[PDB]
Amino acid sequence: FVNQHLCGSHLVEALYLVCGERGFFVTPAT
Amino acid sequence: GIVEQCCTSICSLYQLENYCN
């Protein structure tokens, strides 16, 4: 793993990678 | 908002696992 600023799509990707199938859930952004 | 903190500062594995169960 690489420590960086995570923001935008980098964040959701990092979460999909770190949590796997039990990834986070976000309602539709508007 | 934790999104601001993960963005404006450097995040870690533990911090990201805390956003999940």
Side-chain angles (χ1 to χ4, degrees), chain A residues 1 13-20, chain B residues 13-14 16-17 20:
Chain A
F1 191 85
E13 286 179 272
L15 292 181
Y16 169 95
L17 287 170
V18 84
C19 297
Chain B
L13 287 159
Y14 334 105
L16 302 163
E17 288 272 59
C20 299

Side-chain angles (χ1 to χ4, degrees), chain A residues 1-25 27-30:
Chain A
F1 191 85
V2 48
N3 297 96
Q4 49 182 269
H5 297 286
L6 285 309
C7 206
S9 316
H10 248 260
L11 227 171
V12 36
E13 286 179 272
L15 292 181
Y16 169 95
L17 287 170
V18 84
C19 297
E21 292 191 7
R22 284 162 286 178
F24 83 103
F25 185 93
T27 50
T30 35

